[PDB]
Design a protein around this ligand. Structure first.
Ligand SMILES: Cc1cc2c(cc1C)N(C[C@H](O)[C@H](O)[C@H](O)COP(=O)(O)O)c1[nH]c(=O)[nH]c(=O)c1N2
Ligand SMILES: Cc1cc2c(cc1C)N(C[C@H](O)[C@H](O)[C@H](O)COP(=O)(O)O)c1[nH]c(=O)[nH]c(=O)c1N2
Ligand code: SF4
Ligand code: SF4
Ligand code: FES
Ligand code: FES
Ligand code: NA
Ligand code: NA
Ligand code: NA
Ligand code: NA
Ligand code: NA
Ligand code: NA
Ligand code: NA
Ligand code: NA
Lengths: 418, 156, 418, 159
């Protein structure tokens, strides 16, 4: 049927895995998915033991693509140590600035996600699964609803799936405007009918999650790798990219490049290569000034030779690349990051509630040239004191990027201070 | 006095029956209500609460927490305009100026007829196509006033 | 990327339609195009039925710009009365002397053409279209290939374009030296991997063309109008220029004028105006002696007050204006026209095959003062006898221009007969 | 000693690309021939047998096509083909001055190749640039001729 309008995000792959179909800006339905061997990994998964699927995913070295980078197999392993019933959750809240990687799988190759969800669910003995998709992805929501019906009619969902004895239903939930709902425990609260307030950890979801039961939450992109691991085997999967950090990775690239969009690349790829080899270089061929890794880290133009991996010195994060060039004002940009955290703190913790607001408000005073000497010292102080007592990672990071800009672009800030 | 029109009561019952537990359907119900009225009627919360078998204060907490919901300004078509970092760098201000040239309004404001409301929002997950805006569920990259004018004319 | 070098042909418009971007002598890529309302007419087309589009084009009074001037809408109607599959061909062979109008749309505003192709293909139910571009336009070829990729990226081509269900792929073929391949049946023969031999008609391509299926061939300039018909509506389009010869027209002006180049003008513009009001008058302010409508007609200084339309008393052709002034030798010019037909006859028909060669051979002897009396009489006879048995337009016209020079410039020919 | 001609890999791959590009293989004949001529500086007559195999076409068909299309040359290898327009508009505006200058610079006339195999003058019909007459091309690049000095500078770019 007809779906809401979506911009045609450019996508390019050197690997032809996650973007084999999704490199084309259109909905690929079940017959088209089946044509290239769709749902065959599922069929194979169902003839394997749950424990063996966990072992394969373990040995693949797959790590979470949602930001915390936790090894996926070990997470599944932890969940099945605890008595059932168990729940599986696909996290499709993708609300961090610059990050649009997950939506192109949802909207173009839904069956790639659904297939991974069913395997993953079977692996942990979950008979009930959820996609939590942000509310500002209305098209993605209707695409997933229709695509889930397609799987049901083709016998991949429902009871006694393909004679295996394994039941699964997949419910699709919508967010309603809160970035914190991407945080796994807030996600769970939202699913339980409530405000999206993170919970004190421990306990962690794999022990106590939805309705207090063992719950695995994985990112869209993470789940999208599952088909491939079962299909190729773990050995062939690790042969993709560097052996230490193996597998396909999506990189959403925006800002001042010639070819903004999503790039499927191996994680030995450098940052310079993303920008200059793949994304076309910079608009106007201007010099790179900085790269914002979402709203988390700020890399200087002296840090481009780093690998796009999960190594200590690697880019890290979710591979989100926002490029700023020599005429972008670093302080204006830091203001925008602060504005984001001001709008997204849930307010449970006092230093986070108060600091996200003051960092924005004082930084705005600095930008507009209306800051007193005390507002400047207060800004510095607040920026260093959002993290105390915080029970989730938002409060841990709301000052991080801005602090890095202060360290790496002192002269531009000094100008504002004069 | 406030009962929901039947066509809507039906639609709400669908959501309430879809998850294993009724309460899980609060957000879908609120999206549905807002879709129907162009905003969230405060008086709509009471009987919604009855249908979810929840207290009213819970429903009220939820509406107030989730930013997409509005209980103040009725609007047929909500123009969500991205104000985050990437769209800012790539020309949020030109999109807004161009909305203002065409519609006579700024972010926050509803037109007099209640047709268009401009809603500034955080990143919409389409940064490669900055600057980005939605009109209800439809999403688009902003190219120019000329191009914007012809998109908006599709909404009557 | 780098394309082959092109001369910067001057362009000028009083209408600011086909030459809106192409008046600037560089490539305009998709972002520039989209910024001016590009592909918006396509989007509106896909919300209309195919029948409505034919009716709009029909009602617009658009006529072919390739030389035959056949109503475009009616051509489409003829094609769609025959069962599919149907094919669409944009003719980009432009190889007639003096004619350089189509290339500046291809090289400067490719998307104007591609957008036209997609609407037209949708209108006739064709899911496979071709551009046949002469091999002597390499840059145009590479510009079209790149531009087609851009269209795919933004989902204007491929399967299920913009949720419409309409599928399309545009293929780009190259010519290799033959003017005859601009003739629509020879074009089609070339696309089937064969020599460009014109076919006997009937049957006409709209019933039997590529692979024997209904085929619409349309000229570049013709297709470039389709965007505007849809965008403005057929009613507003028809209000441009004279109501009986409506729409923008491109006029390639060359030879003894101050400002040679392409002019977009209404078709109620006179020939005198093209030369003296737009093209800057003549070099050295010398008098006009003659104007060659390409290699088709020759007009005298007494025939300048005629409309640049397709009226019987009008300029006709493709609007190609080649200006000769008072010191230019008409016999020498005629020789050049003779040499062209000599080089381009396919040779299938005997009077064309031998007449094109003999006309040129005998005229060369007349010009060099080596002609016998019998060669004079033979030249006159062959000039009148190229047309018999001919199955395409070349044979019918190979003597036409030269005959008009004999009739309108007898004193200059007599000089050679002495 | 002698062997049955085979395409080098670099070329065989470009050829296979053109054949895969259209829905029917035989529709790629002209793109294939442009590619061969681009690789060798001409069309080698022995190259036509194996192109016919790849096009699933009879050899005589391929030969007929090669003979019909004027851009293709089976006689003379040249690195750079100088296509000189000899049609009506270029004639009126100085085709002869351009050929004179070409003879003065390169020492050759239309239809000839320089001794080194570098340049061949090829007279052609209207190149569709009549406003920038007189027109010539050097392989894919196209230019207006202005004068001997300006011509020499253009040619200095081909090496
Ligand atoms: C403030 C904030 C916001 C988000 C997150 C964290 C925090 C602290 N996380 C990470 C999430 O809690 C969790 O790590 C992952 O969803 C687990 O899946 P993977 O192991 O990465 O597949 C997260 N993850 C995700 O998949 N999508 C999202 O949009 C977000 N958003
Ligand atoms: C010898 C000869 C040469 C040509 C043509 C005819 C003949 C007899 N035709 C006209 C062609 O056959 C056909 O009429 C048009 O391409 C149809 O398109 P329109 O209806 O003009 O849009 C033609 N048309 C065109 O678009 N470009 C060209 O270069 C030529 N060349
Ligand atoms: S750290 Fe901030 S976002 Fe996280 S729970 Fe505390 S107040 Fe909410
Ligand atoms: S009239 Fe001349 S060009 Fe036309 S088909 Fe016959 S021989 Fe060929
Ligand atoms: S910053 Fe606007 S869509 Fe991401
Ligand atoms: S006559 Fe020479 S390019 Fe046209
Ligand atoms: Na893009
Ligand atoms: Na097993
Ligand atoms: Na994400
Ligand atoms: Na959300
Ligand atoms: Na709200
Ligand atoms: Na969005
Ligand atoms: Na040709
Ligand atoms: Na030939």
């Amino acid at each position: 049927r007809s779906y809401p309008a979506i911009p045609r995000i450019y996508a390019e792959t050197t690997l032809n895995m996650l973007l084999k179909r999704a490199k084309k800006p259109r909905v690929h339905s079940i017959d088209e998915y089946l044509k290239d061997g769709g749902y065959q990994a599922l069929e194979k998964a169902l003839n394997m033991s749950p424990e063996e699927i966990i072992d394969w995913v373990d040995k693949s070295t797959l790590r979470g693509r949602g930001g915390a980078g936790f090894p996926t197999g070990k997470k599944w392993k932890f969940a099945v140590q605890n008595p059932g019933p168990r729940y599986f959750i696909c996290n499709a809240d993708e609300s961090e600035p610059g990050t649009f990687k997950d939506r192109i799988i949802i909207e173009r190759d839904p069956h790639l996600l659904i297939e991974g969800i069913i395997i993953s669910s079977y692996a942990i003995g979950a008979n009930e699964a959820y996609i939590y998709i942000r509310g500002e992805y209305p098209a993605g929501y209707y695409i997933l609803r229709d695509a889930i019906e397609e799987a049901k009619k083709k016998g991949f969902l429902g009871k006694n799936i393909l004679g295996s004895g394994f039941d699964l239903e997949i419910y699709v939930a919508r967010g309603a405007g809160a970035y914190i709902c991407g945080e796994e425990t807030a996600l769970i609260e939202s699913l339980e009918g409530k405000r999206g307030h993170p919970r004190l950890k421990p306990p962690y979801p794999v022990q106590k999650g939805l309705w207090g039961k063992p719950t695995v939450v994985n990112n869209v992109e993470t789940i999208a790798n599952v088909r491939f691991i079962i299909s190729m085997g773990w050995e062939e999967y690790r042969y993709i990219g560097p052996s230490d950090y193996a597998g396909p990775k999506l990189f959403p690239v925006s800002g001042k490049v010639k070819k903004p969009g999503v790039y499927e690349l191996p994680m030995n790829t450098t940052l310079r290569e993303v920008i200059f080899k793949y994304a076309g270089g910079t608009l106007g061929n201007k010099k790179v000034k900085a790269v914002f890794s979402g709203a988390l880290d700020c890399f200087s133009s002296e840090e481009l030779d780093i690998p796009m991996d999960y190594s200590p010195l690697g880019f890290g994060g979710t591979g989100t690349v926002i490029v700023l060039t020599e005429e972008d004002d670093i302080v204006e940009a830091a203001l925008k990051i602060a504005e984001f955290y001001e709008h997204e703190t849930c307010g449970q913790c006092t230093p986070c509630r108060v600091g996200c607001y003051e960092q924005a408000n004082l930084l705005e005073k600095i930008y507009k040239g209306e800051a007193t000497e005390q507002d400047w010292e207060g800004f510095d102080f607040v920026n260093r004191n959002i993290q105390p007592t915080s029970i989730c990672g938002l409060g841990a990071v709301a000052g991080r990027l801005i602090r890095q800009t202060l360290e790496k672009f002192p002269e531009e800030w000094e100008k504002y201070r004069k | 006095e406030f009962e929901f029109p039947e066509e809507l009561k039906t639609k709400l019952q669908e959501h309430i029956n879809y998850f294993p537990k009724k309460r899980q359907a609060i957000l879908l119900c609120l999206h549905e209500i807002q879709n129907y009225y162009g905003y969230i009627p405060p008086e709509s919360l009471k009987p919604l609460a009855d249908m979810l078998e929840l207290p009213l204060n819970h429903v009220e907490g939820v509406v107030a927490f989730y930013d997409m919901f509005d209980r103040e300004d009725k609007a047929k078509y909500r123009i969500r305009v991205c104000v985050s970092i990437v769209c800012h760098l790539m020309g949020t201000n030109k999109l807004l100026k161009a909305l203002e040239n065409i519609l006579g309004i700024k972010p926050g404001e509803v037109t007099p007829d209640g047709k268009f409301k401009i809603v500034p929002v955080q990143c919409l997950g389409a940064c490669s196509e900055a600057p980005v805006f939605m009109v209800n569920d439809d999403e688009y990259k902003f190219e120019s006033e000329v191009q914007l004018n012809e998109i908006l004319s599709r909404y009557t």
